[PDB]
Design a protein around this ligand. Structure first.
Ligand SMILES: *[C@@H]1O[C@H](CO)[C@@H](O)[C@H](O)[C@H]1NC(C)=O
Ligand SMILES: *[C@@H]1O[C@H](CO)[C@@H](O)[C@H](O)[C@H]1NC(C)=O
Lengths: 97, 311, 98, 95, 51, 52, 48, 49
């Protein structure tokens, strides 16, 4: 209770919502009817206050980081070996050059 | 699901801060405030239906009232007299059913109030409402030149949802002015031609229906019998200052209005910095007038990122 | 961000109550005793401090979390893809390979 | 940036003015470029045709009500498109 | 130099706010505000012609 | 007028209504030393530069 | 551009106004006709 | 304290319009091709883009 993750759900329109957030009731004193209570601070907005920097400006090697398939597109590291099967019709004779 | 406002009724609330700075029962109690839009628009839920006449036939200049009375009836009044305030006046720009929407300056409380001169009232709660922006540069009002980022704002359309609410059967609501005790017994005084129940247990438990007939029994205290009006037809939201009925199960469901949707949203551009060249390092001489984010990172294996709001 | 709903309190006139077990999101109940609640028309019971009221509370999602939620994931074993551009003897080609 | 004048006591479905041809848009690209209205600027007296960009009138335009709501006695509307991300205003002046 | 005021005319400007928080055309475009007094005074230039 | 962030000007007729705001950082200012809020009745007379 | 001596002149009202204040223009993105521009902060008031 | 003064923009309808060089204080002049300006009455130039 009081950090990121005190609400859990499979999807957002599901029903198996599990949660603990320190909700404890209190005894009413005033003659008018209501119910008093107290509850911890929402840990989602407490994470949202000091989340830090995102990883679009913290990732090494300099790459755009897409979201919707979660790419890490277009950054540069190491060497990759390839091997090209060139078709032999695109060559010229040494008796021609 | 449903949207029939000929079937639900407003109710009295218990507002913590009335006009005289004392908690009183008020028909203009607000219960939730939502402030997650990017345009400063809020969505207030009051306990008095807006945009409907007394039977609920949907004209856009009258609201149901749920008045104070010795009797127990609802009424109506003109829409022009509802003012929303946080730190100075602000601008109503939507209303449907319970809910309404306004764009209000940064303050600390949220006030709604009828301004009649006959039965004038108010109701405030505390809510840290303040000004927000979108993007990386801070601004006062949105510019006339810049990029177009996407910010999420509320619709002003009535018939769009993003919401869901539970609305169920009403509870028993006894009065003490249905009774008179001019002799050693007690007499039930119902209103003019109504079916009024009672559940009195002086000696042994009793019940029944009384229709404007002063009944007595073997009972000597003025407070040992209760009597409430028996209508049980309309529907009230589960606000925590009502008595539940002995059933208390879901009968209908209504629409929260004012969907939160995406939209394009203009942002400022800042003054591009001049750069001097020195050995393995830039020195960028740069100006701003409002807090504006700068971030840097290397392109190696250690990123070594910085970020600071410079003014 | 959650949303504390609180249903209306259940008062039993001159009797006794107790809470069952539910399965909603963070259900929390505990009974009381010796109340005497008032509405706008007072005296909502008929015996001096011999009755109870109930008090239950739970949470669910907000009506803005369909835009303002936060999808937690768990990633592992990233596998790379490359788009190429092969040109040999003034003849170009565009290839995408794993 | 546009400017239209709708006449008084208008009925339903009456064509006022067309937008798409005015600013160099094609008809088949309106559904491709995400043509909607901006939510904040929408008016109840004017719906919109999302395929050809014509602008009709939804409710019966009463002058004395919106003259009062807006003492200038005007109307406002904004529409946007999302593939190049451009926005532009449309003004309607009832007389 | 002149002060024969019948030979000029007002005009329409273009203001970044309007009455309802959008940039629209307006006849009361404020061009400049000068704020170098010593009791809080303010000299405003608009597009209309007062007096 | 008191300090704020914008400068609005508006016609308030009802036959026509318009307004136009630019953001302009107005803050109060004093003369010499000894920061104050209203000019006192007992004080020293120094030189100012005001508008006509 | 950005410090004292931002704009200079021999007299106060003379026309020999040598100046340099890092003014740059921007291509307008609104259909309405206006000329957007950004500029360095005033050097004299930053000195002041 | 200086005072940035901007005169009115010249617009030419489908013809190239280069500008001269004057000797005022910090003169700066750039062209922008592809405009289509709007006054209170739209279409201030009769020649598309
Ligand atoms: C009261 O109840 C009786 C039946 O118990 C019914 O016939 C009568 O119409 C009711 N009166 C009113 C005013 O509803
Ligand atoms: C392309 O290459 C071939 C031989 O490699 C050459 O004969 C031909 O002239 C080249 N194409 C052009 C346009 O020069």
């Amino acid at each position: 209770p009081g950090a990121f993750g005190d609400i859990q759900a499979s999807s957002l329109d599901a029903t198996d919502i599990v949660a603990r957030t320190d909700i404890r009731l209190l005894k009413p004193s005033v003659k008018n009817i209501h119910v008093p209570y107290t509850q911890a601070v929402s840990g989602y907005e407490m994470w949202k206050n000091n989340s830090g920097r995102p990883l679009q400006e913290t990732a090494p090697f300099g790459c755009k980081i897409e979201v919707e398939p979660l790419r890490a597109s277009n950054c540069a590291y190491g060497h990759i070996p390839i091997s090209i099967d060139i078709p032999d019709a695109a060559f010229v004779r040494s008796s021609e050059s | 699901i449903t949207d029939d406002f000929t079937l639900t009724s407003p109710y009295l609330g218990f507002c913590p801060y009335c006009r005289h700075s004392t908690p009183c029962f008020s028909p203009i109690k607000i219960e939730n405030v939502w402030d997650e839009s990017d345009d400063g628009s809020i969505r207030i839920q009051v306990s008095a239906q807006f945009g409907y006449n007394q039977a609920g036939t949907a004209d856009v200049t009258k609201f149901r009232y749920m008045s104070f009375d010795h009797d127990h009836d609802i009424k109506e009044d003109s829409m022009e007299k509802i003012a929303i305030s946080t730190s100075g006046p602000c601008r109503r720009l939507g209303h449907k059913g319970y809910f309404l929407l306004a764009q209000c300056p940064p303050g600390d409380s949220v006030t709604v109030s009828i301004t009649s001169g006959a039965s004038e009232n108010s109701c405030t709660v505390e809510k840290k409402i303040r000004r927000k922006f979108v993007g990386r540069e801070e601004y006062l009002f949105p510019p006339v030149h810049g990029k177009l980022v996407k910010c999420h704002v509320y619709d002003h359309l009535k018939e769009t949802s993003a919401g869901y609410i539970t609305m169920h059967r009403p509870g028993p609501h006894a009065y003490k002015s249905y009774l008179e005790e001019a002799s050693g017994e007690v007499y039930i005084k119902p209103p003019s031609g109504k079916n009024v129940t009672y559940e009195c247990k002086c000696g042994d438990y009793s019940t029944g229906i009384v229709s404007t007939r002063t009944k007595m029994n073997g009972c000597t205290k003025a407070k040992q019998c209760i009597a409430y009006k028996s209508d049980q037809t309309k529907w009230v939201f589960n606000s925590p200052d009502l008595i539940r009925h002995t059933d208390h199960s879901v009968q209908g469901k209504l629409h929260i209005p004012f969907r939160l949707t995406p939209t394009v949203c203009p942002v400022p551009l800042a003054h591009t910095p001049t750069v001097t060249k020195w050995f393995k390092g830039i020195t960028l001489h740069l100006t701003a007038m409002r807090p504006t984010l700068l971030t840097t990172r290397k392109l190696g294996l250690r990123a070594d990122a910085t970020a600071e709001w410079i003014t | 961000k959650f949303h504390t709903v609180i249903p209306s309190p259940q008062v039993k006139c001159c009797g006794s109550l107790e809470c069952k077990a539910s399965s909603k999101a963070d259900y929390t109940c505990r009974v009381f005793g010796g109340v005497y609640p008032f509405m706008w028309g007072g005296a909502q019971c008929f015996c001096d401090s011999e009755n109870t009221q109930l008090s239950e509370a739970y949470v669910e999602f907000a009506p803005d979390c369909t835009i303002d939620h936060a999808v937690a994931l768990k990633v592992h074993t990233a596998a790379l893809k490359v788009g190429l551009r092969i040109v040999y003897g003034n003849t170009t080609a565009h290839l995408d390979t794993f | 940036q546009l400017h239209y004048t709708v006449q008084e006591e208008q009925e339903h479905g009456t064509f006022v003015g067309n937008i798409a041809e005015d600013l160099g848009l094609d008809i088949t690209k309106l559904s491709a470029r995400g043509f909607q209205t901006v939510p904040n600027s929408r008016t109840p007296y004017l719906d919109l045709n999302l395929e050809t960009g014509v602008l009709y009138v939804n409710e019966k335009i009463d002058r004395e009500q919106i003259c009062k709501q807006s003492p200038s006695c005007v109307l406002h509307l904004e529409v946007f498109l999302e593939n190049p991300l451009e926005l532009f205003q449309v003004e309607i002046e009832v007389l």
